[PDB]
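Summary for the steering committee. One of the milestones for this cycle was to obtain a three-dimensional model of the protein with copper (II) ion bound, which we needed before selecting residues for the alanine scan. The sequence and ligand used are listed below.
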Amino acid sequence: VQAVAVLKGDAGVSGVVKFEQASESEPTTVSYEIAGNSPNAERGFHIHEFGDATNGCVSAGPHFNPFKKTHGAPTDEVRHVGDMGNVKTDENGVAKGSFKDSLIKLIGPTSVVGRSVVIHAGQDDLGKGDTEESLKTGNAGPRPACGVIGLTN
Amino acid sequence: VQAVAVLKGDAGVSGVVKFEQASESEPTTVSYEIAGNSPNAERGFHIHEFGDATNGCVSAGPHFNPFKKTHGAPTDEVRHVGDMGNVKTDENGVAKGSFKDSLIKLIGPTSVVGRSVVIHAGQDDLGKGDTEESLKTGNAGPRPACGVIGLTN
Ligand SMILES: [Cu+2]
Ligand SMILES: [Cu+2]
Ligand SMILES: [Zn+2]
Ligand SMILES: [Zn+2]
């Protein structure tokens, strides 16, 4: 199964995030290319609950968290299903890469098809901050760009 | 269950299409508001197979047709699941309305969540034209705007 989200916004940030998952129990491969970010930085990257674009990136809602866990790093056992950590940007403000994830799925009751991908303007503290907010959003800040995840082939 | 598609394009056409379905076997209520269309006209309106926005409205692919039927009117037994016929535009180029449909679903194997809604620049001939093309696209023409269908609440 393949899916894709086209990230758009009014802040100079844009990109494309592709997803591929063979079967429900297998890892989903997430690959991305995002331009216009601050250079030489780390930016929060997550799947948000709703694929609602009626109000910029605000209507995407919170991090997708069907299991009601706290915000964490992708490698943490305790994390939101949608937690993809930080993406590193180069000297030109480009973030490009790919990784495998076993919580994110394109098949089943937790499918992210129809939800949203959000790239943040700040660094995700991975739930390790001194705040209640750290455990919610990772203090990743603003949402310069986002896109609804659609099914493709 | 609720879903929504925000229609965007570079042709002056834009809008929002909302979907609501209680349970799989029940009709889905489709409501829409679309601006910037030709005034006093009828414009093709359908759900396309892919929620892929990488190439304008082209990447949405063909009309969603899992049952491999020919293109028809919404009230025809023989139609594509995605066939929503024509939407009427007023003197200001606005199309606004709502209808119930029993083939379009937000639940199950034929769910349209993650697919796309496309509003056309021409009138849909409802598969009643003298062509092979009529049975495919209804000769609805260009796709000035489209949006991926996302899950909301
Ligand atoms: Cu986020
Ligand atoms: Cu169409
Ligand atoms: Zn989170
Ligand atoms: Zn059709």
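Key point for the committee: Residues 134-137 of chain A form the longest helix (4 residues).
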